[PDB]
Amino acid sequence: GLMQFTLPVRLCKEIELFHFDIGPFENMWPGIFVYMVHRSCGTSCFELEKLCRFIMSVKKNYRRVPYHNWKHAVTVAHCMYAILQNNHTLFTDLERKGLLIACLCHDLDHRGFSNSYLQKFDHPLAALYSTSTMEQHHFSQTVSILQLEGHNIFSTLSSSEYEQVLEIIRKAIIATDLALYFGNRKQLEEMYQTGSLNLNNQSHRDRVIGLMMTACDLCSVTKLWPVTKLTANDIYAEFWAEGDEMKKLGIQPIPMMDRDKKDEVPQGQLGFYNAVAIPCYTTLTQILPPTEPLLKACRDNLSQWEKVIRGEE
Ligand SMILES: COCCN(C)C(=O)c1cnn(C)c1C(=O)Nc1ccn2cc(-c3ccccc3)nc2c1
Ligand SMILES: [Mg+2]
Ligand SMILES: [Zn+2]
């Protein structure tokens, strides 16, 4: 109850900034998350013992893959923490509880492969979940862990508040399917530009939380350049393994997944910044002005990939 988590001074300060890197000390990441729940939500929103037990079972259900691993879960939660802390009054009590949990759980049991590859492989998950295949699985794994004995961190909510929190989590995790981001962001662009955007409308709040999810999920593009560049190596380690597995099913992979087209990464990064990331952070900044540092850092990283192409690195 009177047991605050405290970080060393440098982390205490930098954890409040959008561009914080959680560091290479895995054993500090649970403490970093609890710190963030305690400041974002309150020391009372979860029983510490149940929260620690939930965090450790979540960690165990992330796999040893290059990118979609436990470090990604905690990194995405931190980006959400920074959004929430910069927008203190915009979010409900249930939202603050659900959203850091959603981010921690949003890639549970990821195997390092896309929805596309599961469907070409004919994986059993592609028969159970015909769209947003991995994202429905990540949600199913979150509910499984919530039901383990002594892992119900929501045990003190009413029936209807529990239903509401699990719905915020389900929609927040589904929204991390980038296939859904394009049309979510177009509707938010139109809604904002015609002045129809209404944060009392639940279906509008859902769209805004969806965009916050894409923003936190893609947040490697918002870090200092060496973090961005080193994270991209892990991203391609996965893409290129998927490509290899496409070649084993007799399917030429897309160039993004073909390690033989390593050469064209820089231009592929530009496309991604221009088509996905910059538009994501631009619309987020229109809706939630205090998130502007995410857009500014993304633009800085776009300029770094432009320097790589000009062989200035
Ligand atoms: C939520 O997603 C989770 C991870 N995923 C899926 C990401 O997309 C993602 C997340 N963060 N970042 C930075 C990325 C990322 O790098 N994306 C892309 C997207 C298209 N490309 C096309 C080419 C390319 C390469 C070589 C040749 C031609 C094209 N390279 C890319 C890279
Ligand atoms: Mg995912
Ligand atoms: Zn993710």
From Swiss-Prot:
Organism equals Homo sapiens
* Disease (UniProt): Dyskinesia, limb and orofacial, infantile-onset: An autosomal recessive, early-onset hyperkinetic movement disorder characterized by axial hypotonia, dyskinesia of the limbs and trunk, orofacial dyskinesia, drooling, and dysarthria. The severity of the hyperkinesis is variable. Striatal degeneration, autosomal dominant 2: An autosomal dominant disorder characterized by striatal degeneration and dysfunction of basal ganglia, resulting in hyperkinesis.
Q: Any idea where this protein resides?
A: Cytoplasm, Cytosol
Outcome, altering residue 107 to A: Loss of activity and of zinc binding
Residues that, per the record, bind 3',5'-cyclic GMP: 68, 269
Q: Which residues bind a divalent metal cation 2?
A: 107
Please give the positions of the paired cysteines in each disulfide bond.
none
Q: Which cellular component appears as one GO term in the record? A: glutamatergic synapse
- The residues that hold a divalent metal cation 1 are 72, 106-107, 217
Q: Which residues of the full protein are shown?
A: 724 to 1036 of 1055
Question: What would be the name of the gene that encodes this protein?
Answer: PDE10A
Q: What does this protein do?
A: Plays a role in signal transduction by regulating the intracellular concentration of cyclic nucleotides. Can hydrolyze both cAMP and cGMP, but has higher affinity for cAMP and is more efficient with cAMP as substrate. May play a critical role in regulating cAMP and cGMP levels in the striatum, a region of the brain that contributes to the control of movement and cognition.
UniProt keyword annotation of Cell inner membrane present = no
Give the protein name, as stated in the record: cAMP and cAMP-inhibited cGMP 3',5'-cyclic phosphodiesterase 10A
Q: Which UniProt keywords apply?
A: Allosteric enzyme, cAMP, cAMP-binding, cGMP, cGMP-binding, Cytoplasm, Disease variant, Hydrolase, Metal-binding, Nucleotide-binding, Phosphoprotein, Repeat
**One GO molecular-function entry:** 3',5'-cGMP-stimulated cyclic-nucleotide phosphodiesterase activity
* BP-aspect Gene Ontology terms: cAMP catabolic process; cAMP-mediated signaling; cGMP catabolic process; negative regulation of cGMP-mediated signaling; regulation of adenylate cyclase-activating G protein-coupled receptor signaling pathway; regulation of cAMP/PKA signal transduction
